[PDB]
Amino acid sequence: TGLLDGKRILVSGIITDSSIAFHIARVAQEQGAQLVLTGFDRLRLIQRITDRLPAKAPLLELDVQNEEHLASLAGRVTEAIGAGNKLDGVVHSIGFMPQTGMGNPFFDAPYADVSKGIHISAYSYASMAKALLPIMNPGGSIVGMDFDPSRAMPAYNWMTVAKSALESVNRFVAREAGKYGVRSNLVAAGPIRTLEEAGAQIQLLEEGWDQRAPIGWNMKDATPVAKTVCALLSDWLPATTGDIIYADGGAHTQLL
Amino acid sequence: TGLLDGKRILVSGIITDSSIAFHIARVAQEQGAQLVLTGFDRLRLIQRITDRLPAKAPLLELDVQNEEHLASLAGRVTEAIGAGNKLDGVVHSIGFMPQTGMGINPFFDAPYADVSKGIHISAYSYASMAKALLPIMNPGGSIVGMDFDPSRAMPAYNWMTVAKSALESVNRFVAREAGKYGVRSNLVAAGPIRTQLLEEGWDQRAPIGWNMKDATPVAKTVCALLSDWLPATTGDIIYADGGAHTQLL
Amino acid sequence: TGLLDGKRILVSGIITDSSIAFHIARVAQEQGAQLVLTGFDRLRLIQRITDRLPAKAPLLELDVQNEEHLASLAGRVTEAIGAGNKLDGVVHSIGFMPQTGMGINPFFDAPYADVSKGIHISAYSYASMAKALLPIMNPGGSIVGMDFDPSRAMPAYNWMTVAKSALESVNRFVAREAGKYGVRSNLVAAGPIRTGALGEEAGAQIQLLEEGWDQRAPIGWNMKDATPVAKTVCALLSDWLPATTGDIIYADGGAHTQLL
Amino acid sequence: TGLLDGKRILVSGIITDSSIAFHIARVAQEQGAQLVLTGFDLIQRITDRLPAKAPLLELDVQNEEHLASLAGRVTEAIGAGNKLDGVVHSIGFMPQTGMGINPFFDAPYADVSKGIHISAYSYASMAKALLPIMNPGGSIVGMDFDPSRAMPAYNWMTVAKSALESVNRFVAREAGKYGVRSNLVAAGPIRTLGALGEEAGAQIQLLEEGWDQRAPIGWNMKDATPVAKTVCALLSDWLPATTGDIIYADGGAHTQLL
């Protein structure tokens, strides 16, 4: 008798057992969900990782920059879950920014690199919704992973810019998803350890988080973020869409 | 299994069966919560409303402007739930602004005495209730208040909107205090509920629609925050408004 | 040849020559404005202070909790600036919270009577002053209030933060009313301005809060100096921000736009 | 004795005399500024209508060579030994696939990427090129329209503005090292130069009429001067402690729900 009993949910973005999506998938299965997983590039390695999840689930290839993968996705999912069945949830846990746009001077990042990062990190949220909405049930939920980009910070640079774009994309996706009786929301997480001046500033930034968070923040524990995503995939936030839920220990609500 | 199974939760704010608190109480009981209810002024009237709930629940008097009521509250709750038990949740569903501060009356014509009463009941009392109840709350617990988005001005709601702006600020400070107990504090910002142009704009703006006759989605959202499923959220606002606030038109 | 040449502007909130309002008044006068000043309670002291401004200006008594002061204000201003003349600007630089609601006292230990007084003076009075003065303001005019960013909680500032959240909301409603007169209403959110007394623990918290500002501000923040804030207020009083109302302008070195 | 007296200011984004940049340039010259203009497309014919002569430099923000040579070309135009006190970014672009009647989901990424390059990334590109020739106390200003909420039609241009707002906050960090401010002006809709059809035309007219209705001081979409003046305020010394920020020149519309 789980929070997600009988729900069919697609989860993208597992690459390691530290991946936020791995914990999302773990909690979702513990709560009764039937999953379809998608992975990028390193499929044999990803299969080895997903073997560590509590239940078996099909793994499909999805490169969000690959138009052919996106064109075939719905059919591939339907084959996996069975004709006449549809998805109740979709989790987007995908991000990438080349090193030039992260860690290197903000100004030295070439647009080619920034563009690739925006494609994967922001545009693909719309891509995946476009592909999947036709196979989603009413009452369904699309959830994307965010971090709060309302203020600039050292190091994350163009990735922050990409999250700013993602939040805007989410609001437009919500308009489209509404036509299908589907919600679209983002979870804005605090820092999670999922793997020199960049490192020093990130350190201060991460140390700041636990001190600002009124309930604390454990950057080694993805479970609170995973549980938040499962809340959004459930029937218990039925009037929330186009929105951002902060799973960050309350840090963004506190100056110090 | 219920979402709130075994949880002891205090719910304020029931005055009618259209009250948002009534629907919160109903859904919470359906999900296995054991409730303590608080009401203001018309306690016999409120008792008859609470008879409509699926399960029996003790009713305690609480006028949030009454310091003696606040002083005795934890002790009266402990009597209601049993010595050695604590609360897992507190729901603040309390608000009031005199007619001089809402409606047809010009914004400028509300006397400060009326505004101050409104702010006392609608904003400061979120802090008062947390002060009274945190000493009898369990770690992992949750305080939830009812809000509406006050980030932009609108016709009519005038000083009540100002009171909600205050309440949002108050919630952020309550989160700091509640955190010391391992307790979360959050507000649910609801769309309009019948408990007109402004109101019908809502369903138009909301990507998933908005039914102002239906409090259940708001009640479910409150229960989500009372549950263990949003453990990293505090000092925050969850919008149960059909997404209306994310859309311009 | 000043930014505010010919403008008649009322400036409230001077108590010392470190008051933000003192610097607003100074800059405004340097820029050709003709001022009327309002002061609370210690008018003799305030007269000695306003003797240090670049020009002589009339001083009117205004306790914003005194309804009779508010009822008579427009009349008294009109006497000060001449029959047939109206104001082009109004500066609200008034705030107050008792020590029970701001400082070392725990957030939960502020009684409502104290919080209510603070909200009266710090937030409600922005509406009060707008109500009293809009009938004697020219089209194109400007009402500016002082704010600090209350969107996140912080140590010490406690109920004054709550009062500022209320003020920001009040400002948006004042903008609706002021618009009828062709008048703008805006707030300037300033960084902290110096205008062991709280002990070492709270003293340390506040110093870290203050120093964090200068570190976050991309252009730095000088907490000794109200001039940049005074200039920002004068920008809002001028004709150069003519399509901005109900709004907040941050004069904080950009601190609020940066996380670390 | 003007607001920008003696200031040397680069203004990009003039294509017609209804361009917001044309109005910014006009007001800036009226206020005593010495301009250098940049354009990319007959533009000299348009810039000839400004009240004073200004050198006009080619700058395609997608062209890396134009960016790499920009500072040197500006220095030659303003004279060795002189630096810029201001820079205005008034540049935006989104293909019709990403903005207008085309469904949100039907914009290919190549089109969206081009739009984000020109509309968002180029704010950083220009700052990079020009900061080394800016005076302390200088000001960089870019044009925005409030993207905090989704709206019909504007679609991926809204996304590009959301990205621009984030870029501005990062440019502020870099610019501060030079004692330079970086801010955006978020304008309400301006009637620059039934093309979209009956249905989407009516949606847009509702979107525009609601703006004047929400604005407590009203909103005249035919008049860019209030926006031009706001830009000049930011270029002036009168907002010396504002950076990484957004100033709304929208009649107050964004502060009101109805």
Ligand SMILES: NC(=O)c1ccc[n+]([C@@H]2O[C@H](COP(=O)([O-])OP(=O)(O)OC[C@H]3O[C@@H](n4cnc5c(N)ncnc54)[C@H](O)[C@@H]3O)[C@@H](O)[C@H]2O)c1
């Ligand atoms: N770790 C954090 O601190 C943190 C905080 C907030 C938000 N997030 C967000 O959570 C999400 C997951 O990050 P994570 O921390 O688990 O890192 P991760 O590296 O485990 O996951 C990122 C995933 O993106 C996938 N990906 C990259 N390019 C792709 C492509 N072209 N097609 C399909 N998939 C692609 C990767 O394969 C990987 O599985 C990201 O959106 C990230 O920005 C992370």
Ligand SMILES: NC(=O)c1ccc[n+]([C@@H]2O[C@H](COP(=O)([O-])OP(=O)(O)OC[C@H]3O[C@@H](n4cnc5c(N)ncnc54)[C@H](O)[C@@H]3O)[C@@H](O)[C@H]2O)c1
């Ligand atoms: N109805 C809506 O459209 C709507 C939308 C968003 C938020 N809210 C909020 O939800 C909450 C509940 O409102 P509702 O719409 O259910 O209306 P309601 O009238 O049913 O509830 C208001 C409650 O506040 C209580 N109250 C008033 N003064 C009190 C005092 N001194 N001490 C203790 N309790 C007192 C009343 O007795 C009543 O039970 C309020 O905060 C309201 O602002 C309502």
Ligand SMILES: NC(=O)c1ccc[n+]([C@@H]2O[C@H](COP(=O)([O-])OP(=O)(O)OC[C@H]3O[C@@H](n4cnc5c(N)ncnc54)[C@H](O)[C@@H]3O)[C@@H](O)[C@H]2O)c1
């Ligand atoms: N100092 C800062 O760091 C800072 C930062 C941001 C905003 N502000 C705001 O700027 C404004 C001015 O504060 P300040 O720092 O110049 O302090 P201040 O003490 O110099 O000025 C506050 C003024 O409020 C007046 N006042 C108090 N009660 C009053 C009443 N009943 N009627 C009329 N006037 C009354 C006082 O007499 C005083 O002149 C306040 O709103 C304050 O919150 C200050």
Ligand SMILES: NC(=O)c1ccc[n+]([C@@H]2O[C@H](COP(=O)([O-])OP(=O)(O)OC[C@H]3O[C@@H](n4cnc5c(N)ncnc54)[C@H](O)[C@@H]3O)[C@@H](O)[C@H]2O)c1
């Ligand atoms: N309603 C409005 O018109 C409105 C409202 C708010 C903000 N804005 C913003 O104001 C700015 C100016 O827009 P406008 O309405 O004056 O339109 P406009 O078409 O006159 O100006 C757009 C400019 O961008 C320039 N441009 C396009 N691609 C370029 C490239 N590769 N390199 C260099 N320049 C390039 C064009 O030449 C043109 O001068 C834009 O950023 C726009 O988004 C416009």
Ligand SMILES: CC(=O)/N=c1/[nH]c2ccccc2s1
């Ligand atoms: C060069 C590189 O690995 N860049 C990354 N960018 C992101 C962004 C989000 C999550 C993981 C990653 S890994």
Ligand SMILES: CC(=O)/N=c1/[nH]c2ccccc2s1
């Ligand atoms: C005069 C009056 O009934 N005022 C109210 N104010 C509120 C505020 C919130 C909920 C119910 C109410 S009833």
Ligand SMILES: CC(=O)/N=c1/[nH]c2ccccc2s1
């Ligand atoms: C007890 C006390 O002096 N409180 C204050 N509160 C404020 C608030 C704003 C400006 C000055 C002050 S002095």
Ligand SMILES: CC(=O)/N=c1/[nH]c2ccccc2s1
């Ligand atoms: C005309 C067109 O296809 N695209 C444009 N996009 C923008 C965006 C901003 C300003 C002008 C324009 S013209």
